[PDB]
Amino acid sequence: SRVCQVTGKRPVTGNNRSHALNATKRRFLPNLHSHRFWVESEKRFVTLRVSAKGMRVIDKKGIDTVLAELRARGEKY
Amino acid sequence: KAKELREKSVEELNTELLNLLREQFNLRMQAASGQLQQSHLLKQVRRDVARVKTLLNEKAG
Amino acid sequence: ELDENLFLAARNLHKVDVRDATGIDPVSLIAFDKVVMTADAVKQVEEMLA
Amino acid sequence: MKRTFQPSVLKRNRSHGFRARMATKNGRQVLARRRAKGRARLTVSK
Amino acid sequence: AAKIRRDDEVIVLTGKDKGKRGKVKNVLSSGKVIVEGINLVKKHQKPVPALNQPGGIVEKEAAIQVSNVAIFNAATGKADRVGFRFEDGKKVRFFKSNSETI
Amino acid sequence: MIREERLLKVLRAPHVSEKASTAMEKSNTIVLKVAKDATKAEIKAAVQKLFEVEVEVVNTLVVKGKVRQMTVRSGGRVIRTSGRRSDWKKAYVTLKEGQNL
RNA sequence: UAAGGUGAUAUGAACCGUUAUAACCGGCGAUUUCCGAAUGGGGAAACCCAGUGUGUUUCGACACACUAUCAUUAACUGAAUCCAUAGGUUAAUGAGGCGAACCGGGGGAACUGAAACAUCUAAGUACCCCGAGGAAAAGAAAUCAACCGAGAUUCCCCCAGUAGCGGCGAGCGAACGGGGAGCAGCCCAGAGCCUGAAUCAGUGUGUGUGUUAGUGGAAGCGUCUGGAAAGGCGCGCGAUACAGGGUGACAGCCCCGUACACAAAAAUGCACAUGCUGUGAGCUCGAUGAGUAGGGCGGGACACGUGGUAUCCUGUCUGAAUAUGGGGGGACCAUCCUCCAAGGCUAAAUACUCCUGACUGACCGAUAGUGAACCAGUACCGUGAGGGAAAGGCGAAAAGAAC
């Protein structure tokens, strides 16, 4: 489902508010993208389904440590 | 009745069970055929079969 | 003071109740035909009712 | 004339039988409700 | 713990048989007893020709409640109660009012 | 090699029923009630070993139990109850030339 | 524990037993068909069809065991492709499904009210889904206060229908502070000295106390009426027992009990006391949770509907400082007060009752009380989900009516 594999971002729910303040009910979707990350340590590409925030997190932390966290949670990549 | 079946081995317990089952079969035939006014040996033979099998389970474990 | 001996001796009697002088209640004083109070019980009820 | 109940055992079992009830969580909920009520005959599977 | 057994000479306390004495024959699980020649009733026995005498007006004793009979002392010549005590590690009944083992 | 206990359980009772007497006296077949889970091989072996006869063939049918209803005075009231008789299995056993009962 | 039993229907038949191995009651155990998570494959529940082993055989066959999926771990072997991964096989653990309410979380109405209706209300209710426990959640200050101070969570009573919010309408509705119930606080982000150093979970013993069968239990007779006495009348007795129930009408003394005093082969609960097993203490130095706080845009939560809007959460885009630093004090700024986020754990007071025991009722008494006093979630109705009744009383005793 539309869940970021790094940050655990999910679709959330909220309201469309009009000018007359009619509250229709909607979803906020995370900015999910499938990307191929080169893992220098073990020499291959891992495809992850991450948001843009997730990609910023990856290139701050590093792909290897994020992969370590993913393995800690039992996520499969 | 269990007291003096408890100190037999395992094979003559088996022969005892076979004799009891044979007696049960002839008793069933008599009851069906109209003989066997002693309509109480049926309960007896079945309780003894149960007793022998209980003892057999006990010795084999 | 609630003498346990008296309480035990009374609690299979018929019309007889034994109190503590802090357990007296409006209905009990009216219900029974006679009320016996020990003198110290009178003193306690005196100070209690002020 | 022709009426609405046209019996057929195969269709009866395939539509309302025990295994059809157990296939989905909604049918299993039906079975749980019928157990809670104390129904003697749980399904049409008689 | 039964307080009335197979053959106790009992005396009836109530029920149109007061003072009549008898021997218990049966003790029923419903707390009733059959005693010798006490609660006679007139059964109207159906013929039933199947292995049975036709039967007319049969006289037979009916069950009576154990609360209605009392063990007979036969030494004091009166009805009395029964207590339980232990002697030789054995539970025994004794007469009250004279404390003699039954 | 069906074991002894199986054989001692399969044969339940001889079935006297006129059609059975005629079968015995005409076709040399006995008719008997068997355990509802008995197979033809089991009945063959059981009859052969327990009656010491030699059998030709076994035919089996399953009798479906009727419904009888009657009353029960449980609770003082005579409640009308109905239920199904038990299904049973009938075996037509053709002996060759012997005779047992 | 026992003089009686083989459940009701139940009569009968054939039997078992009488100090002790009859029955009955309790602890432990054995057996425990088939379906059902159903798990060897399948299936239209309670059925059909197997594979591999081990053993048996009268050579027809037979008996038993194992064989689901997923997760984790291990061993073996292993593609594109050299290494290597993916994959494959086999093991070992664990899960699965059901259940009344209570609990946390993910989603989430409308009728209705506003005397119409759209903001608002109803309402984060009903309902759907996930997860857990005997409770859950929360929890050890980036908390309040006010220049005085308090000192983690939770729950109750006030504050108070107040201050506020609000088509300022309908309506919503606090905190501060006070009184109570309950109450101990601790770890990691790391090294040395001591270095099992008390502590907490598990296990093995012993003691105590419960639970699961039980034991003893006190005292009344005359007479009248009556079918029958427990009632009337008379004279007695017990009471740490006059709770209650039964018995031919209303019984302290007829029965079962009750007060009271005792009881456990065995299995278990809770306390202790120890034995052992893993953890672990204390001191000195250190370190102090970054795509985070904050911001822009859109929403949501805060009593607070964007308003002059503090604070919290985040879908999106960004983005610090580092204890000479940072958060909060209801726009914002300066002073001075207070506290230290971005890591965790934590009993009690609190919520509920499918179920078990005891006890109670100015609760009902057969059109009432559960739908169901009764063989009722039955009969019957409906394809189905589902709906869903009516129906108690002879008599003290069947003595239930021979002829």
Measuring CA to CA, which residue among E3, E57, E58, E66 is closest to residue E35? E66
Q: Which residues pair with A42 in a beta bridge?
A: none
**Total count of domains within chain B:** 1
Distance (Å, rounded) from C-alpha B48 to C-alpha F83? 32
Phi, psi of A72 (to 5 degrees): -60, -40
Q: Which chain F residues are Cβ-neighbours of B25 within 8 angstroms?
A: 8, 11, 50
**B-chain residues near F88 (CB < 8 A):** none
Q: A55 by DSSP, 3-state: which?
A: helix
E80 near E71, Cβ under 8 Å? Answer: yes
Interface contact F12-B33, CB threshold 8 A: no
Does B25 contact F5 at a Cβ distance shorter than 8 Å?
A: no
Q: Taking CA A28 as the corner, what is the angle to CA A27 and CA A30, rounded to the nearest 5 degrees?
A: 135
- d(Cα F60, Cα E19) in Å, to the nearest integer? 71
For chain E, the 3-state helix, strand and coil shares in percent, each to the nearest 5, are 5, 45, 50
Cβ proximity of F90 and F60 under 8 Å: yes
Q: Residue F12 in contact with residue F78, Cβ under 8 Å?
A: no
Apex D32 CA angle, D26 and D37, nearest 5: 130
Measured between alpha carbons, how far is E82 from E97 in angstroms, rounded to an integer? 9
Work out whether strand E90-95 and strand E82-87 pair parallel, antiparallel, or are unpaired.
antiparallel
Q: Which residues of F22-36 are buried (b: 16+ CB within 10 A; e: fewer)?
A: ebbeeeebbbbbbbe
Note every long-range contact of B33-42, with CB atoms under 8 Å and residues 24 or more positions apart, other chains counting: B33/F14
Alpha carbon distance B48, B1 (integer Å): 8
Nearest C-alpha neighbor of E30 from the set E71, E75, E74, E63: E63
CA separation for the pair F70, B48 (Å, rounded): 35
Counted domains in chain A? 1
Amino acid, single-letter form, for residue B36: L
Residues after which a C–N gap over 2.5 Å breaks chain B: none
Neighbour tally for E66: CB within 10 Å = 18
Task: Identify the three-state secondary structure at position E17.
Answer: coil
Strand G and B33 CB separated by under 7 Å: no
Contacts of F12 in chain B (CB under 8 A): 28, 32
Query: How many Å does it take to go from CA A41 to C1' G296?
Result: 38
Domain ranges of chain D: 1-46
Coil vs helix vs strand at F24: helix
Cβ separation F5–B32 shorter than 8 A: no
C-alpha–C-alpha distance, residues F85 and F70, integer Å: 12
CA dist E28 → E7, E25, E66, E85, F26 (Å): 14, 10, 10, 25, 57
User: How far apart (Å, rounded) are the C-alpha atoms in residues F33 and F24?
Assistant: 15
Query: Which of F60, F63, F61, F82 lies closest to F71 in space, CA to CA?
Result: F82
Domain limits at A55? 1-77
Q: Which residues of C10-46 are buried (b: 16+ CB within 10 A; e: fewer)?
A: eeeeeeeeeeebeebeeeeeeeeeeeeeeeebeebee
To the nearest 10 degrees (0 to 180), the angle between helices A52-61 and A63-72 is 110
* Residue B19 beta carbon within 7 A of nucleic strand G: no
Give all chains having 3 or more CB-to-CB distances under 8 Å with chain F: B
State whether the beta carbon of A60 lies below 7 angstroms from any atom of strand G.
yes
Q: What is the DSSP secondary-structure string of F29-75? A: EEEEEE-TT--HHHHHHHHHHHH---EEEEEEEEEPP-EEEEEE-TT
Q: Is E64 exposed, middle or buried (0-12, 13-18, 19+ CB in 10 A)?
A: buried
Nearest DNA or RNA nucleotide to B56 (CA to C1'): G30
CA E21: distance to chain centroid? 9
Q: Which helix (H) or strand (E) holds A45?
A: strand A44-51
- B29 and F5 within 8 Å at the Cβ level: the answer is no
User: Domain ranges in chain F?
Assistant: 1-101
